[PDB]
Write an enzyme that holds these catalytic residues in place. Structure first.
Site, mmCIF file in Angstrom:
data_model
loop_
_atom_site.group_PDB
_atom_site.id
_atom_site.type_symbol
_atom_site.label_atom_id
_atom_site.label_comp_id
_atom_site.label_asym_id
_atom_site.label_seq_id
_atom_site.Cartn_x
_atom_site.Cartn_y
_atom_site.Cartn_z
ATOM 1 N N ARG A 11 13.679 59.374 -6.855
ATOM 2 C CA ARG A 11 13.184 58.666 -5.683
ATOM 3 C C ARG A 11 12.255 59.574 -4.899
ATOM 4 O O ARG A 11 12.106 60.754 -5.207
ATOM 5 C CB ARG A 11 14.334 58.213 -4.760
ATOM 6 C CG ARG A 11 15.171 57.024 -5.252
ATOM 7 C CD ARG A 11 15.673 56.200 -4.068
ATOM 8 N NE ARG A 11 14.544 55.691 -3.292
ATOM 9 C CZ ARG A 11 14.651 55.044 -2.138
ATOM 10 N NH1 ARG A 11 15.845 54.813 -1.600
ATOM 11 N NH2 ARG A 11 13.555 54.624 -1.516
ATOM 12 N N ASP B 262 21.289 58.450 -0.671
ATOM 13 C CA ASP B 262 20.610 59.538 0.024
ATOM 14 C C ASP B 262 21.466 60.767 0.286
ATOM 15 O O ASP B 262 21.516 61.267 1.408
ATOM 16 C CB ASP B 262 20.014 59.025 1.335
ATOM 17 C CG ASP B 262 19.156 57.779 1.140
ATOM 18 O OD1 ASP B 262 18.432 57.687 0.125
ATOM 19 O OD2 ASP B 262 19.205 56.892 2.020
ATOM 20 N N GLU C 242 9.688 57.130 9.195
ATOM 21 C CA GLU C 242 8.830 57.831 8.258
ATOM 22 C C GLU C 242 7.407 57.378 8.535
ATOM 23 O O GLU C 242 7.182 56.233 8.920
ATOM 24 C CB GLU C 242 9.207 57.451 6.843
ATOM 25 C CG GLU C 242 10.654 57.701 6.499
ATOM 26 C CD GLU C 242 11.033 56.968 5.234
ATOM 27 O OE1 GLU C 242 10.526 55.846 5.040
ATOM 28 O OE2 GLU C 242 11.843 57.495 4.446
ATOM 29 N N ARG D 176 6.503 53.629 9.761
ATOM 30 C CA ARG D 176 7.426 52.616 9.254
ATOM 31 C C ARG D 176 8.272 52.148 10.436
ATOM 32 O O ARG D 176 8.837 52.972 11.155
ATOM 33 C CB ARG D 176 8.340 53.222 8.184
ATOM 34 C CG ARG D 176 9.610 52.411 7.925
ATOM 35 C CD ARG D 176 10.442 53.073 6.830
ATOM 36 N NE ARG D 176 11.777 52.490 6.697
ATOM 37 C CZ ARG D 176 12.679 52.877 5.818
ATOM 38 N NH1 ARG D 176 12.420 53.867 4.953
ATOM 39 N NH2 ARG D 176 13.866 52.274 5.775
HETATM 40 C C1 LIG Z 1 16.790 61.787 4.704
HETATM 41 C C2 LIG Z 1 17.008 60.360 4.193
HETATM 42 O O1 LIG Z 1 18.236 59.774 4.142
HETATM 43 N N1 LIG Z 1 15.931 59.727 3.753
HETATM 44 C C3 LIG Z 1 16.019 58.366 3.183
HETATM 45 C C4 LIG Z 1 15.602 57.304 4.204
HETATM 46 C C5 LIG Z 1 16.456 57.406 5.469
HETATM 47 O O2 LIG Z 1 17.827 57.222 5.107
HETATM 48 C C6 LIG Z 1 16.078 56.313 6.459
HETATM 49 O O3 LIG Z 1 14.738 56.533 6.916
HETATM 50 C C7 LIG Z 1 17.023 56.351 7.667
HETATM 51 O O4 LIG Z 1 16.786 55.241 8.532
HETATM 52 O O5 LIG Z 1 15.865 56.011 3.654
HETATM 53 C C8 LIG Z 1 15.456 55.772 2.379
HETATM 54 C C9 LIG Z 1 15.032 54.358 2.020
HETATM 55 O O6 LIG Z 1 14.823 54.088 0.817
HETATM 56 O O7 LIG Z 1 14.907 53.533 2.941
HETATM 57 C C10 LIG Z 1 15.410 56.865 1.317
HETATM 58 C C11 LIG Z 1 15.130 58.228 1.958
HETATM 59 O O8 LIG Z 1 15.423 59.272 1.024
#
Ligand SMILES: CC(=O)N[C@H]1[C@H]([C@H](O)[C@H](O)CO)OC(C(=O)O)=C[C@@H]1O
Length: 474
Positions: free
Chosen positions: A28, A53, A328, A344
């Site tokens: 991922r 995650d 993100e 996002r």
């Molecule tokens: C550090 C981490 O957990 N990153 C994850 C992110 C996060 O959990 C979310 O932004 C929290 O709101 O979510 C997702 C996702 O596919 O949506 C995968 C990322 O790897």
């Protein structure tokens, strides 16, 4: 005529919940970087145990010297060893997750910045109470170690020698200069010359020490076009404020400013959560940056700091507003010097903040573009020039859910305003995280998440396309 290459699988996941040929169930979080030498570096999370995650996750990359046609074997940047005594393997390993890639155009150094969590469930297993992670001593910042039964904070000093809370050296030592493949020995805790455990282990410990249970930011770099990487560097103390709960990167590819008073500045998308509402209503985007070619890092201000929401001002450290969140993000600099941050969010459409000072502060007007749907998933965007005209290419899911990958084209004006011209599909079915790069000669590349035939989330595939694919109707 429009041109789009067939998808090529770079990181292949297993299927039906089973591990792949290398014993890995999932991949991922794609990152794509075109280096000065023209090499393509595809980075990703190598999630061995499952797609969640957390767990055993390695930061790996693959290199292509023929512009995406063929790729070399996987190269592991960092992969911490698991806790062999953890009761639940699915959550019994120190974690690295989500990377951002970028190269300094002057020094040619390639950086990979990613999250680090001690053994646990990552962002979904953070404690309600804070634990100090560092302590200053005579203008020296040392990482703290905690010992059950004692309130005082031990510290890791020169050579990894563990010091007592009272300032006395002990016979314990931490491996601060790992030498094993993937640096899987980082954090190992020794007593004399005998290995006792690891400071990143949080349960069923065999040693007396562990670091603070918190969210960290690590950095590894390569000076040989991605072939070899340095041992992880903990940059957390340079950018994480005392109020911050989670501090992680916005996965993908960062940038280096091309123009303006801040030219040369490296920008890395990141986002935080606070102790007030954490993941429920405090996720806030911002960037961290470096003006000395990656030597030191600094945190910019959050888009949400002093942002007006419903007639009242909020701050990323105290907010509790679901819809005001931005997580993100992907960053782009315009020719007028402005910095754009596509974030996002939960508004259903594309949210974009603008910075006039190299990414430090953000203007009050957070624009929403109904032309570009956002199903609450990561996206990537890049600046590009075509026939003397400035554009921005952005890719993300078209919906309803995380599916129907789209590549959006926007025209950028002198004032920095965006005008969406085209929206073309690039991948049917499941589509999530992605990373765009300009390859040159009018061509572009993209590394993205997709699944089919029962594949585990996700298989990261690569495609290339040209301007004809971007403009003309398919
Ligand atoms: C550090 C981490 O957990 N990153 C994850 C992110 C996060 O959990 C979310 O932004 C929290 O709101 O979510 C997702 C996702 O596919 O949506 C995968 C990322 O790897």
């Amino acid at each position: 005529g429009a041109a789009l290459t067939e998808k090529t699988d770079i990181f292949e996941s297993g299927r039906n919940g089973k591990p792949n040929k290398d014993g890995i169930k999932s991949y991922r979080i794609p990152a794509l970087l075109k280096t000065d030498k023209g090499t393509l570096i595809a980075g990703a999370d190598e999630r061995r145990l499952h797609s969640s995650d957390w767990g055993d996750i390695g930061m790996v990359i693959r290199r292509s010297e023929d512009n995406g046609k063929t790729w070399g074997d996987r190269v592991t940047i960092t992969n911490l060893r698991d806790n062999p005594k953890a009761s639940d393997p699915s959550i019994g390993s120190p974690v690295n997750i989500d990377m951002v890639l970028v190269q300094d155009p002057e020094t040619k150094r390639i950086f990979s910045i990613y999250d680090m969590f001690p053994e646990g469930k990552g962002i979904f297993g953070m404690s309600s109470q804070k634990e100090e992670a560092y302590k200053k001593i005579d203008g020296k910042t040392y990482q703290i170690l905690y010992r059950e039964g004692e309130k005082g904070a031990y510290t890791i000093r020169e050579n990894g020698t563990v010091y007592t809370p009272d300032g006395k050296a002990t016979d314990y030592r931490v491996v601060v200069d790992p030498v094993k493949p993937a640096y899987s020995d980082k954090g190992d805790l020794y007593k004399g010359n005998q290995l006792l455990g690891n400071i990143y282990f949080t349960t069923n410990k065999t040693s007396p020490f562990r670091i603070a249970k918190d969210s960290y930011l690590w950095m590894s770099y390569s000076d040989d076009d991605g072939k070899t990487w340095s041992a992880p560097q903990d940059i957390t103390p340079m950018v994480k404020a005392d109020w911050m709960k989670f501090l992680g990167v916005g996965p993908g590819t960062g940038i280096v400013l091309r123009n303006g008073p801040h030219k040369g500045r490296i920008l890395i998308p990141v986002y935080t959560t606070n102790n007030v509402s954490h993941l429920n209503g405090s996720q806030s985007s911002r960037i961290i940056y470096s003006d000395d070619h990656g030597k030191t890092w600094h945190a910019g201000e959050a888009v949400n700091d002093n942002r007006q929401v419903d007639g009242q001002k909020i701050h990323s450290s105290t907010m509790n507003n679901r819809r005001a969140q931005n997580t993100e993000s992907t960053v782009v600099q315009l020719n007028n010097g402005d910095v754009k941050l596509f974030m996002r969010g939960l508004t259903g459409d594309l949210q974009v903040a603008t910075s006039k000072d190299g990414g430090v502060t953000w203007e009050k007007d957070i624009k929403r573009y109904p032309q570009v749907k956002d199903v609450y998933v990561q996206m990537s965007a890049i600046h590009t020039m075509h026939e003397g005209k400035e554009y921005i290419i952005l890719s993300n899911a078209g919906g309803p859910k995380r599916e129907n990958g789209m590549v959006h084209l926007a025209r950028v004006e002198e004032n920095g305003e965006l005008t969406w011209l085209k929206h073309n599909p690039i991948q049917k079915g499941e589509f999530a995280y992605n990373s765009l790069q300009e390859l040159g000669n009018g061509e572009y590349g993209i590394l993205y998440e997709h699944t089919e035939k029962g594949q585990n989330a996700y298989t990261l595939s690569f495609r290339k396309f040209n301007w004809d694919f971007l403009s003309k109707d398919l």
